[PDB]
Curated annotation (Swiss-Prot), chain A:
Binds to the C'/D and B/C motifs in U3 snoRNA. Component of the U4/U6-U5 tri-snRNP complex composed of the U4, U6 and U5 snRNAs and at least PRP3, PRP4, PRP6, PRP8, PRP18, PRP31, PRP38, SNU13, SNU23, SNU66, SNU114, SPP381, SMB1, SMD1, SMD2, SMD3, SMX2, SMX3, LSM2, LSM3, LSM4, LSM5, LSM6, LSM7, LSM8, BRR2 and DIB1. Binds to the 5'-stem-loop of U4 snRNA. Component of the ribosomal small subunit (SSU) processome composed of at least 40 protein subunits and snoRNA U3. The keyword Zinc does not apply. This is 13 kDa ribonucleoprotein-associated protein. Changing residue 80 to A: Impairs binding to U4 snRNA, but not U3 snoRNA, and causes pre rRNA processing defects and an accumulation of unspliced U3 snoRNA. The lineage of its organism: Eukaryota, Fungi, Dikarya, Ascomycota, Saccharomycotina. CDD domains: SNU13 (cd21104). One of its GO terms (biological process) is maturation of SSU-rRNA. InterPro entries: eL8/uL1-like, H/ACA_rnp_Nhp2-like, Ribosomal_eL30-like_sf, Ribosomal_eL8-like_CS, Ribosomal_eL8/eL30/eS12/Gad45, Ribosomal_eL8/Nhp2. Its main location: nucleus. It is found in: Nucleus, Nucleolus. Keywords: mRNA processing, mRNA splicing, Nucleus, Ribonucleoprotein, Ribosome biogenesis, RNA-binding, rRNA processing, Spliceosome.
UniProtKB/Swiss-Prot annotation, chain B:
Interacts with SIK1/NOP56 and NOP1. Interacts with the trimethylguanosine synthase TGS1. Component of the ribosomal small subunit (SSU) processome composed of at least 40 protein subunits and snoRNA U3. It is found in: Nucleus, Nucleolus. Required for pre-18S rRNA processing. May bind microtubules. Transmembrane segments: none annotated. It comes from Saccharomyces cerevisiae (strain ATCC 204508 / S288c). Present with 34700 molecules/cell in log phase SD medium. The keyword Coiled coil applies. GO terms for cellular component: 90S preribosome; box C/D methylation guide snoRNP complex; nucleolus; nucleoplasm; small-subunit processome. This is Nucleolar protein 58. One of its GO terms (molecular function) is snoRNA binding. Residues 78-153 form the Nop domain. Keywords: Coiled coil, Isopeptide bond, Nucleus, Ribonucleoprotein, Ribosome biogenesis, rRNA processing, Ubl conjugation. GO terms for biological process: box C/D sno(s)RNA 3'-end processing; endonucleolytic cleavage in 5'-ETS of tricistronic rRNA transcript (SSU-rRNA, 5.8S rRNA, LSU-rRNA); endonucleolytic cleavage in ITS1 to separate SSU-rRNA from 5.8S rRNA and LSU-rRNA from tricistronic rRNA transcript (SSU-rRNA, 5.8S rRNA, LSU-rRNA); endonucleolytic cleavage to generate mature 5'-end of SSU-rRNA from (SSU-rRNA, 5.8S rRNA, LSU-rRNA); maturation of SSU-rRNA; protein localization to nucleolus; rRNA processing; snoRNA guided rRNA 2'-O-methylation. The chain holds residues 206 to 358 of 511 of the full protein.
UniProtKB/Swiss-Prot annotation, chain C:
Belongs to the WD repeat DCAF13/WDSOF1 family. Required for ribosomal RNA processing. Interacts with snoRNA U3. Interacts with NOP1 and MPP10. Component of the ribosomal small subunit (SSU) processome composed of at least 40 protein subunits and snoRNA U3. It comes from the Eukaryota. Present with 6620 molecules/cell in log phase SD medium. It is found in: Nucleus, Nucleolus. WD repeats lie at residues 15-60. The chain holds residues 99 to 196 of 489 of the full protein. This is Protein SOF1. The gene is SOF1. It comes from Saccharomyces cerevisiae (strain ATCC 204508 / S288c).
UniProtKB/Swiss-Prot annotation, chain D:
Residues 196-228 are annotated as: Helical. One of its GO terms (molecular function) is histone H2AQ104 methyltransferase activity. Its main location: nucleus. Disulfide bonds: none annotated. The modification Asymmetric dimethylarginine is found at residue 2. The chain holds residues 80 to 326 of 327 of the full protein. This is rRNA 2'-O-methyltransferase fibrillarin. Methylated by HMT1, forming asymmetric dimethylarginines (DMA) within a domain referred to as an RGG box, made up of repeated Gly-Gly dipeptides interspersed with Arg and aromatic residues.
Length: 121, 153, 90, 241, 380, 362
RNA sequence: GAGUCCCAUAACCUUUGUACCCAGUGAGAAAUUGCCGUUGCUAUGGC
């Protein structure tokens, strides 16, 4: 298999990107590989999104190992440009983290998407 | 280090003879231990530099031997009577502690007994406890042959 | 293991007769190492043959259920099978 | 607790575990390989008689479910010095190092891990700690490493799968001795996210009873973890009754 | 069916047992029959060892372990099962063989069509009893320490599946950098001792010669300052890199030197010191070349990005290349100086991730990151 | 994005458009109060996303990320009015004048559509409809409009006086399309609807980011027609760039085949009103001209205009000819980047400019 | 008669010389062509 595994389907990618956008609106999303590693270290991440088209692909492969250590679900989406548009920033984003907030208005959607990601893994 | 220089590989354990290095009954068992050992194989590039480190260790041992011979020669040259009594090592320790052979000569015997035990000596003299029975001279050969309460005597 | 391989809702009446068989067909040979077979007869005027998957041997990496239904004019009260032939009596 | 602070190390009730007393108490284990930290934990150096330096490592209960259980008050820890433990779900080996410290040089820890990249770290750690055997293999199929593992004293299971009861049963029926111990970490979210945690724990305990593991004691790992449970039980092949 | 034979796969070989007595199956869940597995006086009434074929070596042990894990039948298994199992009929009355692994059954069935393989709970109980008792049932026919054979085979199996690479191992770099520092400190200390020991005899040469290794080589070659002459100056010009004028100035300073001529034993001791310095310097140079080669093998991109020795410093500080790849870019430590420090830290983290998670890395992205750092420093 | 509004004359179809004058905002127009109703500075201090020209011809209206609408007289190119949106969050994304009217409909990022009367410089009402930002709005002669939101994936037809809306949702399933093809390729699920245009008072057409151009009627909730991957599929990423390993077979494996391919987004789309011709533009390097069939169920591709290279942000068509023979000029504002963000990277051979195509009928 | 080991083979302190120094945060920053090159003397390459 390739190093970017698992890679989500079209419908799952759309669900994950919409959830990422809503969490970015509600300030529950941490953007970037360094910030994703920081949230994995603090333990506040619920699931991690990476982008499989980044060049090179190796610069975000440390995130799956930390995710496997901390039992955090992780997923790959095809387009870093689509991930950047979902996050709402002006530049492409290669990795994002959905942080933990108990009083969050989108907890059901985040949990459903996390359930599908755990189904992939 | 000499084992590393003689045998390179656990496969070469059977061929290479460690009888010169050691009595090697432990090495006779270490042959089977190397046959069933935990370790992996190593690159020849790594083995060359491990050999170089082992050679440095062997050369440092040779330097140790030469320095010991130099110290023994100078002890026999300047203090032969102390050498016949306590030995080159203990005599050199005593002279180094005193700073000078003349100062060590002017010290009485009670000082020479407790030389090197100043911490325990002065804490006992300041807290009214029992003093050390001996100091650097515990490593002379005769005090070692003594046993029990006869060591202080 | 004190547990069932399989349960069948076999008949609609009382299961009046039950026997365990080794069927011997003309065209084919059943796999008696992997499958066991039993005949049943009831008051719903039927005699049925069943195959059960069995895990005694591990020689390999089919069908559980109704193979053949024997249909009669009246109800059946007992059943037994022949110890060296394919025949049976109800 | 900072650098240079003095503590008093005394034995815990469990064998192979110690407590460092100070203004704040610490759970510690004796380091098999002194002078190294597995995951950047605080280490305690004790000079013991010439004096040879002896080093201890702090066991973090937020990082290790076994430490969370011991601190939360388990009664019977089957992991003891000199015993053979089958660790299922080894991962990078952070708690595996402490299990190795507890069982000591005479013990053996068979650490089964599936993924290859934490398996590299497990293999690298096994060099410094000779009593750890890495088994890079699926724990769902115990027949593959049956040539490698023989007759452990205890089975610890930290794996988080919906079928962990069948995994534990399959490994216990092969490698665990009779009247042996089984220590299980249960995550209700990883088992069944629909029903509640009490329902999940009850069903897992009943599954162990079906597979002939008798649950001795039950613990929930608060405040270290949320909806995490430890079941300690005994493998009674003869009969649970 | 009743079990006639049993196959056990040891790390040290294959074993075939004959089942003398059948344990009853209808009451196989009962307390008596479950305790008879643990008791050795009762299990011996059940089973008896017929044959044992040991493996030839560790490589064959690993090969057979892989074959058993996959479910395949090796030539060794074919040989032992051909020697022990009687030749029976495929149509009726096959020989029953108890197997621990269900997947091994079809392979053995294909090799020997007259063998029915049994892996139910009764056979699992028998195999568990054999595994539990172990060395007792083998009657001393075991030739090697079975526990150490298990330990080594488990290590070999795990290394083989992970494909562990000793070249890709970075602990060589870890030891090499600290050994390099230790050699440098020892060279400095011994060189200071050589300098001042030769200095009370000749103080001007210590200030004249800048390099420690060159000073040691020149001291060993030229020996006594009085013995130094014009021909000795021409000879030592090779060590001084054609500095014949500097050698003549050293000869003049030796003539002007007020230090007494050294004795033979003392100057032999000084030559021992100088030879020690030369050997340590040679080992330091060899270790430096080895460290550079090992960096270009293990972590190329970081090695072109900051340098082989500085990359080794970062790897040693992190503890491992994996740990360096784990830690975030702000954590990695190597106005405008602070900004370029953070930029270089980010590029170091990216290069380390590329090196650690590439199977065989290439220096292309290391060169690209150097180009980006160069562009930003040109901007500043 | 350089905060500049430039006026051009495009009257002579043969010649290039001629610049008359320009107005450039700068950092001096940043208000000192920043209290959301003191944001009445004469110039733009943030980037200008959209512009509209009033049909009578006296006024031109600019709006952008500075959260204000500036109405400028056309002769002096000077502001006669500034209108704050009076919201901290609302950036004006699209402006659309009602045809032959002074009424302006602005779509803001605070999920609103604000209607202004420009001659009176007043605000009539505001309409609240979308789950995400309202990127594009289009309006014909009668008092109604069509808006598209990005990630809600809906198109909304608003009755301005009745404050009511018809909602149109795509609801395409790539598994269903694959099953249909198997009964009879790459199917990309639709992420966001960006651009909208009105063919007539019953039909409107929307472009999405998965390349889909959809023809919608008011009577049907589903699209009547969908042309999928209309502009094309983006080039494959470089195999030597994606992985960074020495082995080219490992690099080709890390390309992961067809999965990393993504289609072009319809960045601009203009339908000439009450007509069957509409033009779609993306950064593929070619505008596309499409014809709606006479039964109005489908459209086909007439032509491809390959003159423009770069991101096509806005397409307009003007007419100058007799009723027998009309001359059409197509002007596209080609830029190196998308007007909303800088997501699209390093498109080859793109220059900022105006692309003009002059088409004469037979 | 009498505490080497607890490093008087040591530790601490002072002074001098040699140096060095005063991990986060997470979205802002800037405010026919602007400039350059080629082709015409008009076409389009780069930033």
């Amino acid at each position: 298999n390739p190093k970017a595994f698992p890679l989500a389907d079209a419908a799952l990618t759309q669900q994950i990107l919409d959830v990422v956008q809503q969490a970015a609106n509600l300030r529950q999303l941490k953007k970037g590989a360094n910030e994703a590693t920081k949230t994995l270290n603090r333990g506040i991440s619920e699931f991690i999104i990476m982008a499989a088209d980044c060049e090179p692909i190796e610069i975000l492969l440390h995130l799956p190992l930390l995710c496997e250590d901390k039992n955090v679900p992780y997923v790959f989406v095809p387009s870093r440009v689509a991930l950047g548009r979902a996050c709402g920033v002006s530049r492409p984003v290669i990795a994002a983290s959905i942080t933990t907030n108990d009083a969050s208005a989108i907890k059901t959607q985040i949990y459903a998407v996390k359930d599908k990601i755990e189904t992939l893994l | 280090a000499r084992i590393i220089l003689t045998m390179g590989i656990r496969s070469k354990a059977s061929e290479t003879d460690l009888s010169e290095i050691l009595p090697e009954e432990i090495e006779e068992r270490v042959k089977t231990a190397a046959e069933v050992s935990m370790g992996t194989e190593i690159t020849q590039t790594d083995l060359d530099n491990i050999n170089a480190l082992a050679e440095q260790i062997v050369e440092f041992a040779a330097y140790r031997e030469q320095l010991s011979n130099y110290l023994s020669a100078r002890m026999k040259a300047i203090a032969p009577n102390l050498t016949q009594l306590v030995g080159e090592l203990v005599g050199a320790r005593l002279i180094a502690h005193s700073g000078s052979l003349i100062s060590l000569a002017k010290s009485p015997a009670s000082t020479i007994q407790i030389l090197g035990a100043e911490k325990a000596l002065f804490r006992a003299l300041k807290t009214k406890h029992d003093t050390p029975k001996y100091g650097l001279l515990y490593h002379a050969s005769l005090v070692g042959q003594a046993t029990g309460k006869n060591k202080g005597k | 293991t004190r547990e069932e391989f399989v349960s069948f809702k076999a008949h609609y009446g009382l299961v009046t007769g039950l026997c365990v068989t080794q069927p011997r067909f003309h065209d084919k040979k059943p796999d008696l190492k992997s499958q066991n077979f039993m005949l049943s007869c009831s008051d719903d005027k039927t005699v049925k043959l069943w195959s059960i998957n069995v895990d005694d041997y591990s020689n390999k990496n089919n069908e559980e259920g109704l193979i053949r239904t024997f249909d009669g004019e009246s109800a059946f009260q007992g059943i037994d099978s022949h110890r060296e032939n394919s025949t049976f009596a109800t | 607790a900072r650098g240079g602070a003095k503590v008093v190390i005394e034995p815990h009730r469990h064998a192979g575990v110690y407590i460092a007393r100070g203004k704040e108490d610490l759970l510690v284990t004796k380091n098999m390989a002194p002078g190294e930290s597995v995951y950047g934990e605080k280490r305690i150096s004790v000079e013991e008689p010439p004096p040879t330096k002896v080093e201890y490592r702090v066991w973090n209960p937020f990082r290790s479910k076994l430490a969370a259980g011991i601190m939360g008050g388990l009664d019977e820890l089957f992991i003891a010095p000199g015993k053979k433990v089958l660790y299922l779900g080894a991962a990078s080996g952070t708690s595996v190092s402490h299990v190795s410290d507890v069982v000591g040089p005479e013990g053996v820890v068979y650490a089964v891990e599936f993924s290859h990249r934490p398996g590299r770290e497990l293999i690298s750690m096994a060099k410094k700690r000779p009593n750890i055997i890495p088994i890079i293999e699926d724990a769902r199929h115990p027949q593959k490493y049956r040539m490698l593992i023989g007759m452990v004293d205890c089975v610890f299971a930290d794996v988080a799968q919906p079928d962990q009861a069948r995994i534990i049963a399959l490994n216990s029926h092969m490698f665990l001795k009779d009247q042996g111990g089984v220590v299980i970490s249960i995550k209700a979210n990883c088992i069944d996210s629909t029903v509640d945690a009490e329902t999940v724990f009850a069903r897992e305990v009943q599954k162990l009873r079906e597979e002939r593991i008798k649950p001795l004691e039950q613990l929930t790992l608060e405040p270290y973890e949320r909806d995490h449970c430890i079941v300690v039980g005994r493998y009674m092949r003869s009969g649970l009754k | 069916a009743p079990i006639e034979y049993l196959l056990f796969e040891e790390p040290t070989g294959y074993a075939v047992f004959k089942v003398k007595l059948q344990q009853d199956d209808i009451g196989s869940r009962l307390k008596e029959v479950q305790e008879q597995i643990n008791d050795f006086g009762a299990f011996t009434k059940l089973i008896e060892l017929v044959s044992f074929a040991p493996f030839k070596g560790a490589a064959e042990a690993l090969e057979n372990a892989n074959d058993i894990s996959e479910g395949l039948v090796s030539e060794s298994l074919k040989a032992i099962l051909d020697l022990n199992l009687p030749k029976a009929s495929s149509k009726k009355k096959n020989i029953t063989l108890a197997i621990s692994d269900k997947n091994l059954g079809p392979s053995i069935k294909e090799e020997f069509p007259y063998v029915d393989c049994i892996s139910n709970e009764l056979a699992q109980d028998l195999i568990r009893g054999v595994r539990l008792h172990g060395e007792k049932l083998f009657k001393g026919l075991q030739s090697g320490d079975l526990e150490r054979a298990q330990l080594g085979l488990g290590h070999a199996y795990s290394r083989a599946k992970v494909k562990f690479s000793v070249q890709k191992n970075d602990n060589h770099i870890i030891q090499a950098i600290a050994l390099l520092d230790q050699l440098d400190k020892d060279i400095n200390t011994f060189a200071m001792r050589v300098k001042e020991w030769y200095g009370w005899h000749f103080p001007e040469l210590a200030k004249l010669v800048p390099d420690n290794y060159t000073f040691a080589k020149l001291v060993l070659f030229i020996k006594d300052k009085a013995s130094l002459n014009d021909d000795s100056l021409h000879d030592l010009a090779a060590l001084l890199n054609e500095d014949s004028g500097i050698a003549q100035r050293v000869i003049d300073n030796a003539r002007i030197s007020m230090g007494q001529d050294i004795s033979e034993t003392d100057m032999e001791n000084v030559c021992v010191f100088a030879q020690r310095v030369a050997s340590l310097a040679d080992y330091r140079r060899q270790l430096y070349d080895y460290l550079c080669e090992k960096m270009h093998t293990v972590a190329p991109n970081l090695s072109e990005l900051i340098g082989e020795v500085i990359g080794a410093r970062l790897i040693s500080h992190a503890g491992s290349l994996t740990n360096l790849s784990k830690q975030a870019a702000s954590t990695v430590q190597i106005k405008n100086k602070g900004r370029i420090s953070r930029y270089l830290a980010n590029k170091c983290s990216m290069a380390s991730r590329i090196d650690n998670y590439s199977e065989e890395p290439s220096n292309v992205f290391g060169s690209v990151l150097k180009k980006q750092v160069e562009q930003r420093l040109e901007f500043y | 994005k350089d905060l500049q509004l430039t006026k051009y004359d495009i009257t002579d179809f043969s010649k290039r458009p001629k610049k008359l004058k320009y107005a450039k905002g700068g950092a001096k127009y940043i208000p000192t109060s920043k209290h959301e109703y003191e944001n009445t500075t004469e110039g733009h201090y943030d980037e200008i996303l959209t512009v509209a020209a009033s049909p009578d011809g006296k006024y031109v209206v600019t709006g952008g990320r500075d959260r204000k609408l500036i109405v400028w007289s056309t002769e002096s190119l000077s502001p006669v009015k500034v209108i704050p949106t009076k919201d901290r969050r609302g950036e004006v994304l699209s402006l659309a004048f009602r045809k032959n009217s002074d009424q302006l409909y602005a779509s803001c990022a605070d999920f609103k559509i604000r209607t202004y009367s420009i001659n009176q410089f007043s605000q009539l009402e505001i309409l609240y409809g979308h789950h995400d930002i309202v990127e594009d709005i289009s309006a014909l002669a009668m008092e109604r409009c069509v808006t598209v939101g990005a990630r809600d994936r809906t198109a909304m037809l608003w009755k301005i006086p009745d404050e009511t809306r018809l909602t149109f949702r795509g609801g395409d399933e790539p598994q269903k399309l694959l099953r249909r093809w198997m009964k009879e390729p790459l199917f990309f699920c639709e992420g966001s609807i960006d651009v909208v245009s009105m063919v007539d008072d019953f039909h409107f057409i929307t472009g999405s980011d998965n390349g889909n151009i959809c023809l919608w009627s008011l009577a049907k909730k589903k699209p009547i027609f969908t042309e999928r991957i209309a502009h094309g599929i983006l080039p494959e990423p470089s195999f030597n760039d994606i992985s960074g390993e020495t082995d080219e077979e490992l690099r080709k494996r890390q390309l992961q085949g067809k999965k990393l391919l993504q289609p072009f987004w319809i960045t601009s789309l203009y339908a000439i009103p009450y007509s069957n011709v509409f033009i779609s533009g993306s950064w593929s390097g070619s505008l596309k001209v499409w014809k709606i069939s006479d039964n109005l169920r489908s459209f086909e591709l007439l032509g491809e205009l390959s003159g423009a290279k770069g991101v096509v942000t806005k397409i307009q068509v003007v007419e100058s000819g007799k009723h027998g023979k009309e001359k059409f000029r197509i002007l596209a504002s080609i830029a190196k980047e998308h007007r909303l963000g800088r997501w699209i990277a390093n498109v080859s051979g793109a220059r900022n400019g105006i692309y003009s195509a002059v088409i004469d009928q037979t």
